[PDB]
Each structure stands twice: as C-alpha cells, then as structure tokens.
Design a protein around this ligand. Structure first.
Ligand SMILES: Nc1ncnc2c1ncn2[C@@H]1O[C@H](COP(=O)(O)O)[C@@H](O)[C@H]1O
Ligand SMILES: Nc1ncnc2c1ncn2[C@@H]1O[C@H](COP(=O)(O)O)[C@@H](O)[C@H]1O
Ligand SMILES: Nc1ncnc2c1ncn2[C@@H]1O[C@H](COP(=O)(O)O)[C@@H](O)[C@H]1O
Ligand SMILES: [Mn+2]
Ligand SMILES: [Mn+2]
Ligand SMILES: [Mn+2]
Ligand SMILES: [Mn+2]
Ligand SMILES: [Mn+2]
Ligand SMILES: [Mn+2]
Lengths: 445, 445, 445
C-alpha cells in the first residue's frame, strides 16, 4: 500500500526512489525521484514521462506500491518501485506496455473461469564472462569472448601462473571448486535475490565451459514471476559486475557448447487445486493435455515472443520437437516426473533468457487456454512438428496466428504489429551484414 | 541579510568568502576574500575589482547577502556570495552585467502590471565523458571524445576486461545499471545541488550513448533560477570531476547522436494566479497565446542569446519549427499537458546549456511581454517559420530586432553591440578554420 | 580526325585507349578499351555506358578525336581520348554534361556576334604535401597535414638529420634551393604537360610554407582550356605521386597561410582583334567594361560554380571586393597592366582550383556577355559589394540569378537544380558535423 511505502521511506532513510518499468524488447528502464517527491498525489496520479523515445511506443508512470524493494547496490538509499505505463488522464494502461498485457492475460484467465491462477516457474540460465569485445564496421566485424574458465585458456600465460583447473567444453556440469570458479558469486546472487524478495531453491554451474551458471528460483503467479525475472536479471548483471565479471542472458554466445535457455514450468489452479493433476498420461488431466495441445498448435507464434532474437535460433537447431513426454528430453514439452502429489505441471523447454518475460508468459498462457477452450488434443508422447527455424519464420507465424493472442483484449493488433516491426529491423541487420564464416567458406570462390 | 551572513561565518568556522559573478558569455567568475574582511563596510560599499580584463566589459562587486551558500567542494571552509557588478561610486549596476539585466527584466514586468512574477524552469542536459582531447594548429586540427559508455568502445581492450554493457547510439534512454553507469554520479549531484539550495525533482540518463545525463530541478523566479543554473552547472562540473569524469554543457559534442538542449518552461503570475491558465488551446489563456506570439515573432533574435555558440546550430538542424502544440514535438513551443490545475505553462524547446541563463531568460521574457503588449496572436497549432539557421543569422537578427530588448532599459545598445562583437569573433574563428570533413569531401579535387 | 587517331595507334603500338570525361563536380572519369576496339563504328556511334552511377546524372560516350594524347604514366601504351556525353540514339549531348555546356557557351557567343572567340587563362595553384591524414567518426574528427617544407618541422627529428632550410609561413615566395624543395618536381610537371599538349610559360613556388606551387600555362579558347585544366590537374596529381608526394587542389588546406586560387584571365576577340582593348580605363574598351559589369552583377551566382566547395569560402574571407582596378589587388577584378599591345584583358581573381573548369568558365562568359548585352556599366575603379560569403549563399544566389545562365540553352533548369542538389548535400555534412575549434571555444561552457 502507499502507507507502507511511506513508512519504508523513514524506516530506511531512503534518499531516492527509482521508478522502474520494462519495454517491448524486455529491458528494464528506470528514472529516479528524490524520496521527498513521494506523497499521496504520486501513488494517486502517477508521474508523467516522455514515452516517445522508448523503443516501439507523453505517458504516465503509475507506481505499484506492492512492488517496493530497497536497491542492494546503489550508493545512496534507494527504494525501487515498479510501475505500469498508463494512457494519460484517461488512465487505462498502454496496450503496448508488457506489464499491462501480462495483467490482462491473468484477468482473462479468471473471466474464462478455467482457473483462478496461473503459476510460472522460469529456469533462466546465464553466462559469466571476464571480457567481451565485439564490433562491426564496413571493413569487418568480430566478437571475442573471454573468461578464466574458458577451456581455451589452458594454453594461456597468466603472470600469476596458469593453475589449469577449468571446465572442459561440455564439462561445466557440476565439478567442485577449484574447477567451478563461481560458488561465491552464485551464493551471493542467491542472498541478494532473496533480499529483493525472491526464493532461491538451488544454484549450480551449468554445462558449458567459460562460465555457464544457474540460480533456480521458486515459482509464482505469472505477472509477479515476470517481475521476479526482471529482478533476477538485475541482480545477476550487477553482482557479476561487483565481482569484476560480466553476465549475459543471450541464448547462444558460443558455437560448440551449451546455450542458455529459460524453461518455463507451468501450472493452472482453480480454488486451491491443481487442474493439471489427474489421471491420463503421467498424472496429467485432460485439461492439461489440451493446454499442451494449445502450446504445440501455436508454438511458432509463441517463438516470436519466447525466442525473440536472431541468436535464439542458433540454440534451437536440430529441444526443437513439438512433442510432450515424461521420457523424451528431445521433446520441447517435458512432463516432469513429480512423483510427489499435485505439484503436477508441464515444462516447456524451448524459450530463452532473451524473451520479454511478460509477453513470453502471456503468450504461453493464451496459447494454453486456446487449447483447453477448443479441446485441441495434443496426441501421443514421443518416448513430427518443430519450433520456428528462424526469427523471420517466428515473426511471420505471430503475424498470421495473431488471433489467440487478441482474445479478451490481451494484445491489440497495434501491439503485435509494432512488436514485429522492432524484431524485423533486428533480423535485417543480422541478414545484411556478412558473417565471418562466409569468408571461410567463400573467399576463394 | 548581512546579519545572517555574519552569523554563518561563525556558525560554520568559515575561513574564506568566495565572491562570484557571471560574465557576458555566461561563465561564472570568482575572487576570494578571507572571512575576516567581511564586515558592515563590505555589504554596504562592495569590493572594487578590475572589470577591464573581463571579456566584453575598475568596477564594484556588490555582495547579495541573500545568496550565501557554503561551497561543498573547496578544502577550507568557504562561503559563496553571489555579486552584482555596479558602476562605481554612483552605484547603479553595469548595463552590461547579465545579472543586472535579469533583475531589470523582472522589475519591468512589474512596472507593466501584466503580472508580478515570471517563473522559469530550465531543463539543462549535460554530457559526462572520461577523456576529451582537441586542438587546432596550422598543420591540422582534431577532437577526440572518450567515455566508457561510448558505443564505440564495444571493441576496445581494457585490461580489467571489457564487460560490454553500454548504451547504444540512441539507446541511453533509460536502461538500468550496469548499462547506465551514472546512477551514483547523478544521485550525488542531486544531493550536492539540494545542499546548495536547489530542489531536485528527478534525475535520469538521457538519449545519447557516451554519457548524456539530466538532473531535473524545481522552478523559480527568473533571476533566482538563472543563479540556480550557475550553481547547477558548478555542481555538475565539480562532482563529475571528483568522480574522474569531465562534464560538458556544449550543445552538440557528437555528430549522429543526441544534443544537449536546455528547454525553458515558462509561466506568468499576477496576485498568486497563473495567467497562462484559461480557456483557449489546451487550457491556455489569450494572454499566454500572445506570449507565444512574441517568442515566435522574435525567435531569431532570441537565438543569439538562447543558442549563442556556432556549435548550437549543429543541434538545431532539420526543434526548429516556430510553432506551438500540445501534440507536435517538432514544434519548438510545446504546451505541456499538465492535466493538473494551473501549473499551466508554455515550454520553449529550442535553447541550449551554452546560453547565458540571465540574458537567455531576460530575452525570452521581453519577447513574451512584447507579444502580450501588442496582441501578437500566435496562430494555429501544428499537430512555417524556423529558428535562426546559424549564429551569424541569429546575431544579424538580434542586431535588427533590437527594440523589444531595449524596452524599459532592460539591455542598452552598448550592451547588445558588445555582445554581438564577442559572438562574432567566435563565429569567425570557426568560419576561417578548415574543417576535417572538408578534407574528406575536397582533398581529391 | 578518326584517321589520325587510327595512325597513332600503329605509330605508337598503343595497347589501350582511355576514354575520359568530366562529371558535374569536375572530376575526370575514365574507362579503358583495348586499342583493337577503335575502328570506324567507334568514332561514328560512340560507346555506351551506365551514366546512372555518375554523381548527379545508359548514355553514350562520343570520342572527340581532336583530343588524342598518349598517357605519360600508364605502364602499357595508352592513347587518351576525351569524350562528350551524348543522349543515346538521338545523339545531342546531355544537358548536364559540363563539356557540352562549355561548347554551347562558345556557340552562343558566336550566335550573338559579340565576338568569334573567348580566351581563357586560368592560373591554378596547388599544394604538394608528403602525408595527409584525416577522418570523421561519431567520437571525433581530425586532419593532419605534413610536408618536409612545413615551417612546423623546424623542431622535428628526422634520422637523416633535420637540415632546416624551409619556407617560413608566408615565405614560400621565391627563395632558391634548398629552401624551395620542388624545382625538379615542377620542371618535370612542365615537361610532361607540354608532352600532353600544354604550353608552359613559367613555374615557381607560391607564398605558402608546406609546398604551395604554380605552373603557369598559355591560354586557350574556353572549352579547349577547360580540357587543359583537366590535363593540368592529372599531370600534377600523377607526377607528384611518382615523386612520393601528394598534390591537392583544395582552396584552403591550412589556416594561417595562403590558399590556392585559380585566377581566370579573360579576353574576347572578333575577326582576329581584341575587343577588350580600347580607350577607357587602362586601355580597356567600353565592351570590356560591360563584361566586368556582368561579372560583378552575377558574382554570387558565379561563386556557386567558381568557388563550389565549403572550403572555398575559408579562402574568400575579408579578393572579396567586387571591384575592378589596375591598382587595387584587393579588387577581385584586376585589369593587368599589359603595357604591351592588345594582349589587353581582364583578370578575375576570386575562383579556385576546386571549380569545374567547364561550368566555371561557361558561367564567367555568360555573365560577361549579359553585361555587354545590357550595357551594365561597371562603375569606377577602387585604387562596395562582395563575393558570396558561403556556399549556401552562393547556391541560393545561383538558384535565383538563374536567367543569365539559361540564355541560348547553355544550362537548363534541371542542370542548375541537380548541381545545387549536389552542392547542398556537401554543405550539410560540413554544417552538421561539430568542428574541432568548437571544443576549443565551447567545451567549458
Ligand atoms: N505447481 C507448479 N506450477 C508451476 N511451476 C511450478 C510448480 N511447482 C514448481 N514449479 C516450478 O518448477 C521448479 C521445479 O524445478 P525442479 O523441481 O528441479 O524440476 C520450481 O522451482 C518452480 O519454479
Ligand atoms: N507554473 C510553472 N511555470 C514555469 N515552469 C514551471 C511551472 N511548473 C513547473 N515548471 C517547471 O517545469 C518542470 C516540469 O517538468 P515536467 O513536469 O516533467 O514536464 C518543473 O520541474 C519546473 O522546472
Ligand atoms: N589575350 C588574352 N586573353 C586571355 N587570357 C590571356 C590573354 N593573354 C594572356 N592570357 C593569359 O594570361 C596569362 C598571363 O600571365 P601574366 O602575363 O604573368 O600576368 C597567360 O599565361 C595566359 O594564361
Ligand atoms: Mn539448466
Ligand atoms: Mn528443466
Ligand atoms: Mn531531456
Ligand atoms: Mn521538455
Ligand atoms: Mn599565384
Ligand atoms: Mn594573377
């Protein structure tokens, strides 16, 4: 409540308030107010800003006082307050603001009476590098990745000495220190995440050499979880920074080793009971099977939002199979063997950390409901259709399979069209710029 | 009062008093007295100095005791006292001293009875660079800008490692840390500004890569606000310095990305009521519309004072349109959608931080009154005349449209003529020195 | 004749023929044919090329066999043949081709019967540097000039030793070797110019330090002289190159020392007699005085063609005075004291080597005839109006004073409009790019 935020201000000698919001691409934006400007009027009528220079968008920032967190990093005491972008005066909420769209998808779920709550559990992976250099110019282009754990540094001269304990290319999965360099950086990221209201469940090194890591975090309702992904990413980017590292959530930074994916575990619930539990395949309900059928039916349009970068598809090369299974981890829909009771859920393995968590989760939900809503029966478990093979494909597919997103006003046509416009500009730059292996392939033509 | 300054001296064990004033170009000058020379006589009869070596000008410094502030940066305890330049013995105030001219414009407003107070709200932007090198010699010339946030450093080797989170060229607008490097430098600038009597409203990163920033500050009456711009700039220049950065208020340091403008929000008030509020376009009064008409009528002469550098016009290339609107941000006169009550105001978007805040605000006011005074009706909102396309143009225009500035003794002819003389010397050096892209264009002629 | 070219081919074992032409900007273009493709058909029906990628323009290259010269530089025996750009099939000559325009101006002179021939004598100056570096990028810009004769190298360490005989800044005018480093380079340029059909009269070092030089060359009829300027420039650029130098015809490469101008001496003649000789001022005819009056009347439109670069105006800063005189070398129209008989002529001092010699000479002629044609009496000799103060000014002026160029079809409106379009793009790049002395002037604003 406003009341609560107003006490924290004194209770923490808060000097500043950081208004934050996410844009269409998924990047958290922010603007800072002195604490002495937070008073009744503020939580009532918001703060005006020029929405114009935000990519793909005067507007009003409406503080959601439920979201107040103290920032673990800024030097002066700052309270972060997440905001919604509202349409000014009229005060309804920009139909292009991803948080609004997530909230609308939750209310539409309620209005359909299929369940009261959607539960999401994203498993975001990241890379923790020491040095990243890249550039493109008329005369050429390059990218140079470096990290102390990079199997390639086995030959490197270091002046402290080389010490040689390092994860090999698919060998980052699980060896103790000193091979895993990041125990203290991951534990610290866990401690600061919980200080910002997240619940850590586990943290470990991932498969890739050169710093792949994962902090596993307890689930939430869709828009609350989407905001927890924006905090998750902020803490990873800044703790890494305090440690002299640089973190990145891009899907595929290195060829020849693991990519960073963000698997979404999903579940539906009506009056305190898990609709996805039942009889049917592996403890699932018929309700759950139609959810899978909706996801598989709309998978390529979902890819435009869940895999929104050209780089995303360097990861999705032959979890490409649109199939469910408790057995096949090749199938992009895994039914986790919970064994345990009614923590029954589906897991979609294909999305990645580059995805806008609001639009990605809204689109998984809307697809899943359209399955239920039309008895779109999934089929049989692989123990055969695939995800979009490229961003251009995914964008065409969202453009044509537009209907299930527009249900109940969740996503307007302008919203979908402006999104595709942004993602196309990006796809073009990558399409028209000559790639380094093309010189390898074709210079002596 | 003198009395008050005299207590602060003991109340702060003040070792020195810094007499400060602004020159015609707008640079704050200063001379330092030991606190033990501040006594009755001083606030009565001022301190004599050689005004002769000030660009464009024995004279007397008259301490304005209302302005006393403790300096947040000097090592020994110092009290800053702003001064007016008076004509000696006769004690009237140099008609070339920009502070005097601002004060005269305020009194003339009162004498016309159109209102009692003018309210100004400048939005100054700045750049925060790490390294700036430049030079001109017979054999050549150069400028080299560098900052850690410069999109161009994506390829750079750094020895700590490169870390790569950096604002792209028009992407400085709003991303959270680590992409925005300046959160702690801007918050600190806010805290020291308030310690010097300013009221911060917001601070944020601006659009440009390579360190564009903005600290938004609460309005004031014209001459008080002009002095707050001189403090604003001092704190930005010195906090940046403490942080190992270098700040600059020049309008256009980089081609191909955002320029730093200083938008002036203006409003008039008679007996506690806002004359700019009313019926008419977007909540405006007819009174306000004539103010806009006066600004547009005199815009090119105003440019000689509000855009006084050759570099200013590298920014003003096709907010060039002399038009008002609540909709068109292309129109140099924006009528802000306040929605709220009688915070109704006009916003002139074209001036820039290089402007002398006293002469710039005095000229906006005098133009705006001449509108009112002659019913110069603005026209219709663009939802078509332009600002001076160059300093030479702007200077010719001030020289010919001289009358509205001379009203009521605000600005003498000697004052206007000496000003144009200074700005011309500058324009010539830039006109006669061969430019680097001319070698690009014409060497192989 | 074709016949003659065909013998030279055998008479010189010519392996290739170089088709050359000049574009709107004034740069000589070329395309190369094997000698075995030169036969009847060629001199009859020309050779087709894609005129489209020539700046400001399928078309036909029509070889003018009167122009055949052997190239003194290419490794394999090559005969240069100058061409005209004709409109294809219809075969009339592009009204945008500068050579055509020059030829039209000569025929129009004949059709007016004012005289049979126009004689031009351009005095082009150049600089001969060792190293020229420059560049502009988002993060900065620069130009670096270097030459062994640069007064600035007096302090330089050279590893052969420094030797110190060098022209001071305005001291390049006339000292013997070793101070003048270029005696052998200029004599060689004279010998190769004559081998290409020019007649040298004198060669000497010019006023500037860092390599200003001049090869003085015997006059000719307008279009033949315009082609001799294209050969003049080719020989200077390539002999300099053989010598390890780099030559440039840009008007003002260095601030603080001499610029390179190209003064045009002009004269008119009817039936073997010089119309400019007579009674009147300094041996001039009344006919000649009206020529001067036409040049002065149209001087700013002539500047758009005779001074076509933004850099041109760094030279033309306060021969700016539009005045004739035998005494005042301050007056842009000098009446040379010939003393001798009927080598009476006028000299226009303001054009520069960057000018397209065809369009520059065509415009001087057309202005001069419009004087005669309308008795535009010049006035009295200075012993007061000036040239355009900038390219933008000059371009506006050509755009408005368009009529005298359109006389008799010499220059169409499309031709004039496309020209101004090219020169504007150039003026903009120079206008919008921040200049290095602006950082000197305005960084600490
Ligand atoms: N009922 C549920 N619905 C949706 N997601 C869930 C549910 N229960 C757990 N999760 C998510 O799935 C994760 C389990 O990872 P794991 O149990 O190791 O496969 C939890 O951390 C939550 O993020
Ligand atoms: N009545 C007023 N007259 C003039 N300037 C004003 C007035 N009210 C506010 N301002 C200025 O305009 C700024 C508002 O910025 P924003 O409200 O974000 O467009 C304030 O910070 C003041 O600088
Ligand atoms: N009758 C003429 N008409 C036009 N140009 C001439 C004429 N006679 C000489 N010239 C040119 O003027 C130059 C004379 O340079 P100077 O005699 O040293 O002033 C010659 O080299 C020709 O380029
Ligand atoms: Mn994982
Ligand atoms: Mn999983
Ligand atoms: Mn701004
Ligand atoms: Mn504004
Ligand atoms: Mn000369
Ligand atoms: Mn001469």
């Amino acid at each position: 409540s406003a009341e609560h935020v107003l006490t924290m201000l004194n209770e923490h000698e808060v000097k500043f308030v950081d208004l934050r919001f996410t844009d269409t691409k998924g990047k958290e934006q922010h603007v800072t107010i002195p604490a002495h400007q937070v008073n009744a009027e503020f939580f009532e009528e918001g703060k005006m800003f020029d929405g114009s220079s935000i990519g793909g968008w005067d507007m009003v920032l409406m503080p959601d006082a439920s979201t107040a967190v103290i920032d673990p990093f800024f030097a002066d005491s700052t309270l972060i307050i997440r905001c919604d972008i509202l349409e000014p005066g009229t005060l309804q909420g920009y139909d292009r603001d991803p948080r609004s769209i997530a909230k609308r998808a939750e209310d539409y779920l309620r209005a359909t009476g299929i369940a009261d709550t959607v539960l999401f559990g994203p498993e975001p992976e990241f890379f923790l590098f020491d040095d990243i250099r890249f550039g493109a110019s008329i005369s050429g282009s390059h990218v140079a990745i470096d990290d102390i754990e990079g199997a390639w540094n086995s030959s490197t001269k270091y002046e402290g000495g080389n010490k040689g304990h390092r994860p090999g290319v698919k060998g980052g999965y699980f060896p103790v220190p000193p091979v895993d360099s990041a125990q203290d950086i991951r534990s610290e990221m866990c401690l600061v995440m919980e200080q910002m209201g997240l619940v850590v469940e586990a943290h470990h090194h991932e498969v890739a050499t050169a710093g792949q890591n994962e902090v596993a975090t307890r689930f939430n309702t869709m828009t609350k979880k989407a905001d927890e992904i924006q905090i998750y990413k902020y803490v990873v980017h800044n703790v890494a920074h305090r440690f002299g590292k640089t973190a990145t959530f891009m899907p595929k930074p290195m060829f020849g080793d693991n990519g960073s994916g963000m698997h979404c575990h999903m579940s539906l619930a009506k009056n305190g009971t898990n609709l996805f539990s039942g009889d049917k395949y592996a403890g699932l309900s018929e309700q759950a099977l139609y959810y899978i059928g909706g996801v598989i039916k709309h998978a390529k349009a979902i890819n435009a939002l869940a895999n929104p970068t050209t780089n995303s598809y360097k990861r999705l090369v032959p979890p490409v199979m649109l199939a469910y299974s408790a057995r096949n981890r090749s199938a992009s829909i895994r039914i986790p063997v919970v064994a345990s009771p009614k923590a029954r859920r589906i897991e979609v393995r294909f999305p990645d950390p580059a995805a806008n968590p609001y639009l990605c989760f809204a689109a998984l939900l809307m697809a899943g409901l359209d399955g239920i809503k039309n008895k779109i029966h999934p089929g049989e478990p692989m123990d055969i259709p695939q995800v979009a093979g490229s961003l251009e494909e995914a964008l065409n597919a969202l453009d044509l399979d537009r209907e299930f997103l527009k249900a109940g006003g969740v996503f307007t046509d302008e919203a979908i069209d402006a999104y595709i416009a942004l993602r196309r500009e990006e796809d073009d730059r990558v399409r028209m710029t000559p790639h380094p292996v093309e010189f390898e392939l074709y210079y002596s033509v």
